Enzyme design. Structure first.
Site, short mmCIF file in Angstrom:
data_model
loop_
_atom_site.label_atom_id
_atom_site.label_comp_id
_atom_site.label_asym_id
_atom_site.label_seq_id
_atom_site.Cartn_x
_atom_site.Cartn_y
_atom_site.Cartn_z
N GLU A 297 0.79 -1.23 0.00
CA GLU A 297 0.00 0.00 0.00
C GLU A 297 0.83 1.29 0.00
OE1 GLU A 297 -3.10 0.03 -0.64
OE2 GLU A 297 -3.85 -1.95 -0.08
N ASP B 227 -6.24 6.20 -5.01
CA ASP B 227 -5.77 4.81 -5.07
C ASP B 227 -5.80 4.26 -6.50
OD1 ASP B 227 -8.40 3.92 -5.66
OD2 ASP B 227 -8.74 3.10 -3.67
#
Ligand SMILES: Fc1c(F)c(F)c(Cl)c(F)c1F
Ligand SMILES: [Cl-]
EC number: 3.2.1.17
Length: 164
Positions: A11, A20
């Site tokens: 991440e 994202d």
């Protein structure tokens, strides 16, 4: 290696609101804020999450706090899901991490389609499970990450995350 270090690799860490892989406002260590295209909506979600008026920027400590909560939420979510709990319970600790990783990324709703993969994992048919897991939107959209997670399911080792 562990679930925290693993997800930290997958991440990253960013202290300002970013989008994202799906284009959604996110912060910290893959903390999804909202699917709304409104930046103001995202900032509101952030403030609510942190408990202060942030205007889009948080500290590393704050990022890690949300991260811990998110990992916890993923685990507790698996344990309360009747379709996921048995498979999770059947796994060793390394493969459990791989499970948590998937839920973290896609949620329980994003994972409802993995029924056949789940069966194969519970059966410990690791190679078959690995092949089945790659037959997914997940794999096609995030292949390098999926490949790491799948290798973890296939081998029960941290080999895909050593060197990283
Ligand atoms: F335990 C598991 C889960 F909770 C899960 F969601 C998925 Cl996709 C899995 F593949 C798994 F093994
Ligand atoms: Cl911002």
């Amino acid at each position: 290696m562990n679930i925290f270090e693993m997800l930290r690799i997958d991440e990253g860490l960013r202290l300002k609101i970013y989008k994202d892989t799906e284009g959604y406002y996110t912060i910290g260590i893959g903390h999804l804020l909202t699917k709304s295209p409104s930046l103001n909506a995202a900032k509101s979600e952030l403030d609510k999450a942190i408990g202060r008026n942030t205007n889009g920027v948080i500290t590393k400590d704050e990022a890690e706090k949300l991260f811990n909560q998110d990992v916890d939420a993923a685990v507790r979510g698996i344990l309360r899901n009747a379709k996921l709990k048995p498979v999770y319970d059947s796994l060793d600790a390394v493969r459990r991490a791989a499970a948590i990783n998937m839920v973290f990324q896609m949620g329980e709703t994003g994972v409802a389609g993995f029924t056949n993969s789940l069966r194969m994992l519970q059966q410990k048919r690791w190679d078959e499970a690995a092949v089945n897991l790659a037959k997914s939107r997940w794999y096609n959209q995030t292949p390098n990450r999926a490949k790491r997670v799948i290798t973890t399911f296939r081998t029960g080792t941290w080999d895909a995350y050593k060197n990283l």
